Ligand binder design. Structure first.
Ligand SMILES: [Mg+2]
Lengths: 49, 49
């Protein structure tokens, strides 16, 4: 019924949002690794110059 | 009745998670802007050869 169908959709939406949080945090971590990499390359292209 | 309560707390969780997601997306956007700025610094250095 209505109450239980609403419960089900809310549980799925909560799970969808938790996954999105975990995905964004992982993307933030990936980005942190990308940034140290490009930093060393900006330093290296100053030396290589 | 327990479903009204369960639904209520799931709705609050949905609302808190959406705000978390918004914050994380703003952090990620800023991190990517910071990366773009150094990528333009990088493209200068390889161009100076
Ligand atoms: Mg946003």
């Amino acid at each position: 019924g209505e109450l239980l169908s609403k419960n089900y959709h809310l549980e799925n939406e909560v799970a969808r949002l938790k996954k999105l949080v975990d995905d964004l945090e992982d993307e933030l971590y990936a980005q942190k690794l990308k940034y140290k990499a490009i930093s060393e390359e900006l330093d290296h292209a100053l030396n290589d110059m």
